[PDB]
Structure formats: structure tokens, C-alpha cells
Specification:
Two copies of one chain form a homodimer.
Chain A (H helix, E strand, L loop, with lengths): L1 H37 L4 H26 L8 H8 L10 H15 L8 H21 L2 H17 L2 H12 L2 E3 H25 L24 H31 L1 H9 L3 H13 L15 H8 L28 H19 L9 H22 L4 E2 L4 E2 L3 H16 L5 H8 L6 H18 L3 H8 L5
Antiparallel strand pairs in A: 2-3
Helix pairs in contact in A: 1-2, 1-4, 1-5, 1-6, 1-8, 2-4, 2-11, 3-5, 3-6, 3-18, 4-5, 5-6, 6-7, 6-8, 7-8, 7-16, 9-10, 9-13, 9-14, 9-15, 9-17, 9-18, 11-13, 12-14, 13-14, 14-15, 15-16, 15-17
Protein name (chains A, B): Chloride channel protein 1
GO molecular function, one term (chains A, B): voltage-gated chloride channel activity
Organism (chains A, B): Homo sapiens
Chain lengths: 467, 467
């Protein structure tokens, strides 16, 4: 009936908005890279471009939000949980918030600073759901909004099924099966539009298509390397709790310290400014970014960390791994650069999600999990250079496979969800990594749940949301 | 805490019970085939073996159930829905029911008669959940039973994630996310045990491992053949409604007709007897089974219908497709034999799920959907012998891929679920068939929901369950 039209419109509109956002963000990232390379010889000028491009974009995000809608900052999942639990917010689901969030998120995603997309997208989609509901009906509420959430993450990860399931877990305590089906229908239409848009504009934005891996794995799967996948999970759960803890601590700190809050209220663009500056100054490729693959932007990181190669073996021969040759440093061993990437991007992601801009957490923690997973996988490939024999099969170590698992585990420990495995399955391949991933993500969730709250639940607490 | 132990025990116990059941059922199917082949020259004796083996096993199933627990018949999902909605039944979750169901289902699955496994398994698992809860705690209830449901279908399809999601959709109207995580943990442990059991006993029972396909498909996917996948969905929705309708009509008919019910009450083994006899007499390979691949047993059918070949092209050259050469009849064209399989197995499945034995519906309708899908795919391969060019890629038709989609669509129209796509994704490959399957299953659900109730909802109505 009318609900069917609502779902179709939701999917279509979201796919279009998401595509547009991603397109402009990708074009901005290309200009970033091009401008940096245009100042090639001059090192001080390379620094200028490398730090000011993100600075301008993040400062713009903050300013735009502040001016248009100051409630279009900081994810959407925490506040959607509150709204779905009855407590409607202020001007959260308004049209100004839409404009603010969409433009400011595009700018944040085209800066290279590790900000998220999933959170803001859920809010963007819920605004669109509310708007579409008004446009259709007036020209329950929880049902409308919960489908919004589903298509938000569905169009964010470019993963229909996984997205719907993710939303259900992060935005609801008791879901209705009707809303599950409705969200799935709308998300499949979003994916349909995405496929048509792909045919139309080819290159444009590769909406999560770089994360499609090419792992030729044997179906039975080595249960001798399952302990490693489980260890990834356990450690990712611990690190997920550390992420949540440290993020909450910084989030509280900047306001709970009277002097800090006062100073930052007088100068609203000081906090985003300094954070962006230091992040970009540490990712400067001819500076510290050579030891942490700072040249790589969020998406490129995941695309290379999910490679079908073994960096530890092709270290003597770089320039053969493609875009994954930035991880091989002339001197520093790959393992140590993946470690430094993880460490550096841990604090970077924590402080970037604290900035007054639209920022979520999935992608930052996804690249962090991928880094941890890859580190483990590369060490496993160093410990087992000839592979591990199981029954009669010498299973070779695929470090990129470990990365996929690690990504799902850390991003499932931070968000307290087990649907990240499904998101990963659809973004990559499926079999021979189902059990490994399941074990890892479940173990991660367990450890993290026992230690700290979820990112969104912790943000609810920081903002003292009625919930 | 104690819940973690409950989940681990549930998964372990279910994996063991399911494996044992499947092992004995597979050994029975092997004896069936062996005995049939031992009477090779004598056609009347081949008939005897072909019809009496299933007869004995089904009559035994019925008798065992009747004697031990007469409430261990007819699926479990319909009655689990009722129990989960507060209305506890009689001696449904008792230990006699366990024995009855497990033994009788093993016999029904080793007969070759199209009976299901998913439904009874959900009941078997819920009994085990209740028993484990008593064993643990005494030595809420809905939470315990819900996890049982999840691990039941998880160990049935050998699909952890898909199973959990399936159960949520078929046994609940409003699910809690806690139960989702709990069910997932228990189902991943079930899968873990299954992997260990596989290593241990190798051949034994190939727990849904024959359905693992080898489709080398191109990622972008032909949107020019998407209309065909959508048509599969629409038609599968119509056929799913016909299945439900006809099954309900037969189910009501046998009791609503006074004379029939009276006669069948005096002779309880008459109905199962005659149904089994006629099904087996029509699947007799040197009789009518040559035109409907009756030699193939439920699992073998799915394994061959999910082949990476094109029967329409290798018809002049059979004995090269392997076990899929039974579909190529010397005279009758493959397409017509797949059609006859579908038609014959449609009524067969409808009347087999009406028998007084433990019987579900997933697998019967899964093979029916696979047949329909394959028929479409083979016709598509006949209409497009050189493939269909999209952008710059000549996508070749993979009839087996269409079968996977058809299976998910018809089994999602009968059960009114969209999680069958995920079950299929995990049973087979994933990418390049996500959107096709999603579209198909959603369209199937839509058409079917608009026409008839779900199988389980219709059974609830037949049995006048309070629900």
C-alpha cells in the first residue's frame, strides 16, 4: 500500500543521497591527492597541502553544522536509540539537520581524517524517513524511523542484509519482524539503485566495492588456525573496550574540565582545528606517515589490508603488491608499520570522533580492526611460512583474511553487535570464514560487553540522554 | 554466567543429536540405494525394494510417534509460535517427545519421501533447551526456548547466521536483541562441533556440504537477467501460496471429512501407507522416475540442481555431468523432466507433510524451488546460448545459480521469511547473487503474503492453536 511506496522512496532517496555524498567525497579525496602530488619537490608545500586540505574541510564541517543545525553533530545512533525509545529530541529530525549533516559529512569524508559514516547516515536516513512520511501520509513513528535506520546503514556499507541486521541491533532492544522485512525491502531497493548508478557512472564512487576481496580459500577451513582467529576476537574485544573507554574519557574531559569547555566555547573551531592538524601532521607521508602508511586514506587502507598477498614475504620485493606497497617500508619491517598504523590511528580515531562534526565510528574502528587482524595474519605467516597442515591440506596463511575477521571483531566490540560478521561476509567472500568470523566476533562482543559499554551507549551516557 | 554454559551445552548437544540423526539417515539412504541396486536385473524386485524401504520407515515413524508421544508429529514451528506466545501446550516439551521425534525423523529422512527436517528440529532443539535449562538451573522460559529454536535451524541447515535469523522470523512477532546474540553464540558453537565432527569422521554425513556450490560468477552481475530473477520470485510467491493452500486443504480434508477421519482413526497406518506407496511408486526410477529424476533423493536433488553445468547444452553428451546426468533423459528434454520433477514433487511434498509423522517443510519446498529456478535458468540458457552482454561483459547463464535463487524464493514464500536468502548465501557463495536473491525473495514474500498465510500460520489455523 502506502508503506510499500514509502519503502521504495526511502531506498531510492537514500541511495541517491549516499551516492552523491560519496561521489563528492571521493572527488575531494582525489583533489587532495592531486594537490599533494603537484607540490612534489617542495617538502614544506607538500606539508601545507597535506594539513590544510583536511583542516579546511573539517573546519567547514564544524562551522556549517554550528550555523545550520548544531544538533547535526556526533553520530545518530545514540540519539536514534533515544528517539526510538519514545523520547523525541529537539530539532533532530528536521530539514536543517539534513542539510547540515549531509554537507558536513561529505566534507569530513573527503578530508581523510578518520571520521565515520555509519552513524551520521542512520540519522540522515531517519530524517529522510520522517520527511518522506510527511510528504506521503500528511500530503507508527517508530516503524518509520527504524526502517530509516536500516536503509541508512545498508546504503553506508553497501551491504543490504548486514545493514538491516546491524541497525536492528544498535537501535533497538525489542524489534518487530514486520520492521525487519520492511527495512530489508527498502535496503534492497537502495542496492538496486546503487547497481543502476554503477552502470551509469562506472568509475564515479566505488561504493564499498574496493573491499570486495579475492581470497581463494579452501572450504573446510583450518581449525588449527582457529585459535588465532579466536585470539583476534579476544584482543579485539579488549581493544574495543579501550576505544570506548578512551573515547568517553576524552569526550567527557573536553567538557567536564571547566577551563577547557570555556575556552573551546569561545573558540569553537579550536578543538577541531588542533585535532585535525595533529592527525594530519602525523600522517604526513614524508614524516611519520612513512612508518604508518599515512598516505593511505580510510578506504584505501581497508582495500590494501584486505589484500590477497603476504606482505611479510614480498618485503624484499615491493612495487609488486600494488597499492599495498606503501606498507612495505625500505627499513622498518611491515609488521612494525602495521603496528604503528594501529597505534597511531587508535588515538587518531578516538579524538576525531570527539570533534564537533558529524562523525560515527564504524569505519574508523573497521580500519583499526583490519590493521590488528593483518598484523596477526602477517605474524602467522612469519611463524608458518610454508602453511599449516590440517588433515591432508597445507592451508596457507592469508593475512588479508585475518584482517577481515579483525575488522568485524573490533567494530563488533565497539558497537556490541554480531551483525558485523554479516556485513563483512557481504563485503567480501563468505564460506571458510564464517566460523572463524563468528567465533571472533562473538568472543569480541563477550569481552567488550564485560568491560565497557557500547560506543553509542557510552555516548548516550556522556550526553545524559534520557534513553 | 550460567546462561553461557546453557548456550554452549545447547549448541554441543544439538550438533551431536543432529549429526547422529543425519548419520543414521544417510546410512539408511545408502542401504536403500544398495538394496535397490542389488535387485538390478529383476524389475519387480527393484519395485519391491523401492517402495517397501520407504514404506517400512514411514510406517515405523508413524507407529513410533503414536506409541511414544503422539504430539511429536507435524513440525514444531507452528506449536513453538503458540508456546512462545504464552500458551504452553500439553506434553510438547517432554522427554518422550524428544525420543519420538528424533527416531521418527531419522526414519523419515532416510526414506527418501519428501519430509522436512527444519520444523521437527526446532521442536527437538526446544525440548533440549527446556531439558538443559532444568538440568542446569533446577539441578525467562521464552528466552530459553527462543535460543532452542535458533540452534535447531542452525544445526538443520548447517547455517549458523541464517538459521538464527530464520528462527527469529518464523517463531516470533517481537524479538529481543539479547536472544539474537544468545542464539547466535549457541549456533556458532553448534557449527564448531560440526566442524570437529567432520574432521573426526570425514565421510559420515555430509551435513549440508553438498549444497556448497562452485559458481564462478562475475561480481558486477548482469542486471539484464535481473528481470528473470524477479520473475522467479513472483512465480515462486504464487506457487508458495498454492503450496500452502493445497497443503491446508488436504490437511483439513482428511479430518473434516467425517468418513475419512473415522476410517483413518481405525486404521492409523493407512494414510501414511498409501501416501508413501504412491509417492514411491511414482518415483520408481524405471517407471515414472525416469521422467522426473526419482532416483535422486532430496539432498542429491539439491546438489545436482545447484550444479555449475548447463544441462540444456550437455544433453547430447550425458555421463559427463556426474550425478546430474539423471536429469538428462535419452528422449525427454531436460527442461521437461525438471518440469515434471517440480509438478510431481509438488503434490508429493504437499501430501507427505500431511502424514502423521514428524515432518517440516523447508527441504521439500527447497528442492521444489531449486527445480523451478533451474527450469527458468535452463530456458534462459536456451534463449541465450551465447550469454547476455551487459556493459562490456558477456554474462553466461548459470542455471544452477537460478536454482539457488528459486530455492530461497519458494521456501521464503511458504515460510513468509526473507532470511532464506541468507541461509542460501551461507550454503553457497555470496556476491553477485545478493541483489538477485534479495529481489526474488522479497517479491516472493510479497506475492505470497498477499495471497495465503505462511505454512506454519496455516497449520496453526488447521490445529486451531490458541496462538
Amino acid at each position: 500500500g502506502e508503506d510499500g511506496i514509502f519503502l521504495v522512496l526511502l531506498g531510492l532517496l537514500m541511495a541517491l543521497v549516499s551516492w552523491s555524498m560519496g561521489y563528492v567525497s571521493a572527488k575531494s579525496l582525489q583533489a587532495y591527492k592531486w594537490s599533494y602530488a603537484q607540490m612534489q619537490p617542495s617538502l614544506p608545500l607538500q606539508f601545507l597541502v597535506w594539513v590544510t586540505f583536511p583542516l579546511v574541510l573539517i573546519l567547514f564541517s564544524a562551522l556549517f553544522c554550528h550555523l545550520i543545525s548544531p544538533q547535526a553533530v556526533g553520530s545518530g545512533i545514540p540519539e536514534m536509540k533515544t528517539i526510538l525509545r519514545g523520547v523525541v529530541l529537539k530539532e533532530y529530525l528536521t530539514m536543517k539537520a539534513f542539510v547540515a549533516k549531509v554537507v558536513a559529512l561529505t566534507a569530513g569524508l573527503g578530508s581523510g581524517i578518520p571520521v565515520g559514516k555509519e552513524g551520521p547516515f542512520v540519522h540522515i536516513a531517519s530524517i529522510c524517513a520522517a520527511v518522506l512520511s510527511k510528504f506521503m501520509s500528511v500530503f507508527y513513528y517508530s516503524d518509520i524511523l527504524t526502517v530509516g535506520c536500516a536503509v541508512g546503514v545498508g546504503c553506508c556499507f553497501g551491504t543490504p542484509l548486514g545493514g538491516v541486521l546491524f541497525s536492528i541491533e544498535v537501535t533497538s532492544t525489542y524489534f518487530a519482524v514486520r520492521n525487519y522485512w520492511r527495512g530489508f525491502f527498502a535496503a534492497t531497493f537502495s542496492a538496486f539503485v546503487f547497481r543502476v548508478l554503477a552502470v551509469w557512472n562506472k568509475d564515479a564512487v566505488t561504493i564499498t566495492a574496493l573491499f570486495r576481496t579475492n581470497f581463494r580459500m579452501d572450504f573446510p577451513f583450518d581449525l588449527k588456525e582457529l585459535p588465532a582467529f579466536a585470539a583476534i576476537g579476544i584482543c579485539c574485544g579488549l581493544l574495543g573496550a579501550v576505544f570506548v573507554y578512551l573515547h568517553r574519557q576524552v569526550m567527557l574531559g573536553v567538557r567536564k574540565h571547566k577551563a577547557l569547555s570555556q575556552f573551546l566555547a569561545k573558540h569553537r573551531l579550536l578543538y577541531p582545528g588542533i585535532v585535525t592538524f595533529v592527525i594530519a601532521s602525523f600522517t604526513f607521508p614524508p614524516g611519520m606517515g612513512q612508518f604508518m602508511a599515512g598516505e593511505l586514506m580510510p578506504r584505501e587502507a581497508i582495500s590494501t589490508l584486505f589484500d590477497n598477498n603476504t606482505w611479510v614475504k614480498h618485503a624484499g620485493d615491493p612495487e609488486s603488491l600494488g597499492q599495498s606497497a606503501v606498507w612495505i617500508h625500505p627499513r622498518v619491517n611491515v609488521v612494525i608499520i602495521i603496528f604503528l598504523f594501529f597505534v597511531m590511528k587508535f588515538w587518531m580515531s578516538i579524538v576525531a570522533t570527539t570533534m564537533p562534526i558529524p562523525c560515527g565510528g564504524f569505519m574508523p574502528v573497521f580500519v583499526l580492526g583490519a590493521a590488528f587482524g593483518r598484523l596477526v595474519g602477517e605474524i602467522m605467516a612469519m611463524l608458518f611460512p610454508d602453511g599449516i597442515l590440517f588433515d591432508d591440506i597445507i592451508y596457507k596463511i592469508l593475512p588479508g583474511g585475518y584482517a577481515v575477521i579483525g575488522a568485524a571483531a573490533l567494530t563488533g566490540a565497539v558497537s556490541h553487535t554480531v551483525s558485523t560478521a554479516v556485513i563483512c561476509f557481504e563485503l567480501t567472500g563468505q564460506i571458510a570464514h564464517i566460523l572463524p568470523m563468528m567465533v571472533a566476533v562473538i568472543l569480541a562482543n563477550m569481552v567488550a560487553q564485560s568491560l565497557q559499554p557500547s560506543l553509542y551507549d557510552s555516548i548516550i551516557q556522556v550526553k545524559k540522554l534520557p534513553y
